Amino acid sequence: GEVAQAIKEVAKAIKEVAWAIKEVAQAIKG
Amino acid sequence: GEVAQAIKEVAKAIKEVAWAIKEVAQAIKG
Amino acid sequence: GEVAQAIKEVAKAIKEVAWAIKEVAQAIKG
Amino acid sequence: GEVAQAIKEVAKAIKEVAWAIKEVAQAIKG
Amino acid sequence: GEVAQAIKEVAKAIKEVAWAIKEVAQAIKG
Amino acid sequence: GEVAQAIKEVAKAIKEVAWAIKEVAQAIKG
Amino acid sequence: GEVAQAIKEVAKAIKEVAWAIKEVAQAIKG
């Protein structure tokens, strides 16, 4: 369904946030 | 539907947050 | 509809979060 | 409606996160 | 209703995030 | 209901994010 | 149901955000 699929897109985008934060940790480490 | 499309807007906004966090990582790396 | 409109407000607020994080990147670059 | 009003509260809370991130930016520029 | 109440719980949790971020700002000011 | 229960899981996860951000604050204070 | 399952996916993604922030904390501490 379209509402479920849209919520799945929100989940995917939040995973992108997690990855970007892992990039921040990596930057801090060098 | 209007609810699904609005939820898609949330996903896109969250992607913008991920990108902004990538810029923080790059700021730290520099 | 009221639910869709409210969800759009959530999207707009998340964009505000992205802009604030960019300020953090610029502060670091500072 | 109660669901729309609750979602608007989520939006309001996300605005507070944005303000808090602005405080982090100020602290860094500090 | 249970859905509206659950969404209010999300709003409250997000406020906790805003408070946590303020602690980061204060730590940086330290 | 399952939808309310899933939304409660989202609130629980957001609280975990708040705790992690407090951990960042301790690390900075460190 | 598909909507509840999608929301659970959002919850799981938010947990990934929390774990990533813990990596940021550990990076700062080290």
Author numbering:
A (entry chain D), B (entry chain E), C (entry chain F), D (entry chain G), E (entry chain A), F (entry chain B), ...: 1 to 30
Study authors write:
CCs are quaternary structures comprising two or more α-helices supercoiled around each other with cyclic (Cn) or dihedral (Dn) symmetry. Here, we describe variants with all combinations of the aliphatic residues, Ile, Leu and Val, at a and d to give four classes of peptide: the ββ class, with a and d = Ile or Val; Lβ, a = Leu and d = Ile or Val; βL, a = Ile or Val and d = Leu; and LL, a = d = Leu.
As a = d = β-branched specify blunt-ended α-helical barrels, we explored all four combinations of Ile and Val at these sites. CC-Type2-VV, -IV, -VI and -II, were helical and bound DPH in solution consistent with α-helical barrels. Concomitantly, the dimensions of the internal pore diameters increased: VV, 4.8–7.7 Å; IV, 6.2–9.2 Å; and II, 9.0–11.0 Å. Finally, the modelling offers a clear explanation for why the ββ and Lβ classes exclusively form non-collapsed Cn-symmetric α-helical barrels. Sequences from both classes scored worse when threaded onto most of the slipped and collapsed structures (upper-right-hand regions of Fig. 7e).
